[PDB]
Amino acid sequence: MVLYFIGLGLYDERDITVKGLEIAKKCDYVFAEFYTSLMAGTTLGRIQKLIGKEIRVLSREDVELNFENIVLPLAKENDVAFLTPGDPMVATTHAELRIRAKRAGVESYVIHAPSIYSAVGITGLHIYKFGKSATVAYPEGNWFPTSYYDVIKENAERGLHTLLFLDIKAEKRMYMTANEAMELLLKVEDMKKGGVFTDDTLVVVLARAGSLNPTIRAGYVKDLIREDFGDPPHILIVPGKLHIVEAEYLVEIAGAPREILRVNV
Amino acid sequence: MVLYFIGLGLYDERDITVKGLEIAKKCDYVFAEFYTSLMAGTTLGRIQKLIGKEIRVLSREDVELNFENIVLPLAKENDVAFLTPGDPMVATTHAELRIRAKRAGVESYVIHAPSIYSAVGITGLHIYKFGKSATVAYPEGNWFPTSYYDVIKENAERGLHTLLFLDIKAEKRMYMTANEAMELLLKVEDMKKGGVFTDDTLVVVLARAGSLNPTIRAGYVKDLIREDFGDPPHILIVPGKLHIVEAEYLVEIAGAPREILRVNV
Ligand SMILES: Nc1ncnc2c1ncn2[C@@H]1O[C@H](CSCC[C@H](N)C(=O)O)[C@@H](O)[C@H]1O
């Protein structure tokens, strides 16, 4: 009679919480989805081994179109687990899955896990200063989306930081790199000439958050655009005006140039 | 010679990530602070019991003034862990402690844990729609903080949600409730009269996130300002313009007035 939404965390199989692991182990059935994001530091096999249960993977269509036919049925007579990367309820479409549960007379509970939204705190940037968040999407054929650019403008304009999620073709396991995101933004800047993202813009790159050895680099676009940040996933952030303490952290921990202490504070 | 900042999560000792628990079990010395946030569903004993190590709790002064004299000295010859509620780098000044570690020649690593900053996703409000965050601080003597009121105004102007961390004086065992924060907000409104926070403002209250049964309520201030949301901690959220799906969730899961379903696009 119970459905558990369990977050898997940031990077590998150990990023699930103890509560999530113990509950998953007591569930009769375990489903998982890997279309909203991926666990770059592990595999389905390793998560299955840790949980000690077979995991039925579900596609986007499986969830969005048939969640009530695939998952909820079993939940009326058993304890069922639905695993997702990061924190459940963060992916925009997940919240309403709880409404489907209710509609089906099934109780659901949420077991949280770390998310990039909170994990960026490791960049030394104050979490309260982040504004609206966005996703950098790959242009396609005749489609060139650029709203993520306006989000940066509106946030920076108020001295707020902008968290940028990079495009990901989950199924094909293809990640957009920080380097590509930067190239895209420069191209958008050249189209909109808003002086929002240039070679002089200060940016922060966070790669493999959750790993014990993530890549945290801060610097100007002209210098980082061709730098190697390692394996995915990459998260790009365009900081607003910095507080001296934020700049000190970026310099001492993220290898940023001393120059930011006078130019970006 | 390493220092590990390990998050313990939102509510109880099991909100720690498996990664965090396994590393903590192997640390020679374990320190912790419980003043930046309240873990309502556990005790020091249960945490010590789970980690299998004796935990020395530090006060704000111990950390902010003597971290490099109490903790760092040991991380020079041993593996040391510093535990905190939620995520160690979120809405705290703990990030600066990594700088102290560096200058003391100590390597530090961060292990994330579920945070209230991302757990807000459970309210059904799109997390990418949250703007600048702020804290409702207790008035002290003749000093009456109000900056958080302007944060709400700015976000609302842009149609963004506002996350309000509530004040806490752990030493006095004081935990600001959503009701108290609402009372303070109404008083600020009388003074500034910006039409930002009134009896008719729609708010969302999340209490004891991370527990299996948190309290999630949405409604007008006039009806919620005297409602009992249970034991702390509580966060208050002032939504911006709602998407239809956000409203449906607030009504279906948070018991909001069925009338907010009618959005004035
Ligand atoms: N489980 C919980 N439920 C509701 N609010 C919570 C909460 N945990 C923390 N908070 C809120 O956040 C404030 C502390 S701010 C420190 C937050 C912490 N680093 C984290 O990652 O969560 C509290 O006063 C409270 O208003």
SS3 label, residue A69: helix
Measuring CA to CA, how many Å separate B131 from each of A235, B89, B95, B115, B225? 18, 19, 22, 17, 23
Strands (E), chain A: 2-7, 29-33, 56-58, 79-84, 107-111, 134-136, 162-166, 168-169, 174-175, 202-207, 215-220, 234-238
Domains in chain A with CATH codes:
1-114 (3.40.1010.10), 115-265 (3.30.950.10)
Strand arrangement, sheet containing B215-220 = B134-136, B162-166, B234-238, B202-207, B215-220
Q: In whole angstroms, what is the distance from residue A261 CA to residue A247 CA?
A: 6
- Smallest CA-to-CA distance from B34 within B171, B219, B185, B222 is with B171
CA distances in angstroms from A95 to A79, A128, A166, listed in the order given: 19, 23, 22
| Tokens read off for A102 | 């209710």
Rg, Å, chain A Cα set: 20
Tokens of A175: 């990640």
Query: Which residues fall within 8 angstroms of residue A116, CB to CB, at 6 or more apart?
Result: A10, A86, A163, A165, A206, A209, A235
Q: Which of B65, B67, B60 is nearest to B102 (CA)?
A: B67
From CA B184, how far away is CA B137, in angstroms rounded? Answer: 9
Residue B194 structure tokens:
């910006």
Measured in angstroms, how far is the CA atom of residue A250 from the centroid of ligand 1? 25
Chain B residues whose CB is inside 8 A of the A252 CB are 99, 102
Cα–ligand 1 centroid distance for B251 (angstroms)? 24
Nearest by CB to B18, which of A18, A102, A129? A18
Cβ atoms of A199 and A186 within 8 Å: the answer is: yes
Report the residue among B8, B35, B38 best suited for mutation to probe ligand 1: largest number of ligand atoms under 8 A from its CB: B38
- Measured CA to CA, the distance from residue A163 to residue A231 in angstroms comes to 19
Q: What is the rounded CA–CA span in Å between residue A38 and residue A32?
A: 11
Residues 6+ apart with CB under 8 A from A110: A4, A5, A88, A89, A98, B122
What is the experimental method?
X-ray
Phi first, then psi: what are they for A209, rounded to 5°? -60, 140
The alpha-carbon gap from B262 to the nearest alpha carbon of chain A, in Å, equals 18
Query: Are the beta carbons of A166 and A136 closer than 8 angstroms?
Result: yes
Helix (H, G, I), strand (E, B) or coil at A228: coil
Supply A183's token pair.
Answer: 């190239």
Residue A110, φ and ψ in degrees, nearest 5: -105, 125
Coil, helix or strand at residue A223: helix
Strands B162-166 and B234-238: antiparallel
- C-alpha separations of B163 from B76, B84, B126, B231 in Å: 39, 21, 12, 19
Query: B122, A102: Cβ pair inside 8 Å?
Result: no
Please indicate whether, in this complex, the C-beta atoms of B50 and A248 are within 8 angstroms of each other. Answer: no
DSSP track, chain B: -EEEEEE-BSSSGGGSBHHHHHHHHT-SEEEEE-SSS--TT--HHHHHHHHTS-EEEE-HHHHHHHHHHHTTTGGGTSEEEEEESB-TTSSSSTHHHHHHHHHTT-EEEEE----HHHHGGGGTS-GGGB---EEEPPPBTTB---HHHHHHHHHHHTT-BEEEEEPEEGGGTEE--HHHHHHHHHHHHHHH--SSS-TT-EEEEEESTTSSS-EEEEEEHHHHTT----SS-EEEEE--SPPHHHHHHHHHHH---GGGGS---
CA distances, B75 to each of B106, B145, B242 (Å): 7, 39, 48
Kindly tell me the sign of the dihedral angle through the C-alpha atoms of A244, A131, B118, B198.
Answer: positive
Distance CA(B151)–CA(B26), nearest Å, equals 43
Question: Token digits for B151?
Answer: 């944060």
Residue A120: helix, strand or coil by DSSP?
A: helix
Phi and psi, residue A152, nearest 5°: -60, -45
Q: Edge-to-edge, what's the strand order for the sheet holding A107-111?
A: A56-58, A29-33, A79-84, A2-7, A107-111
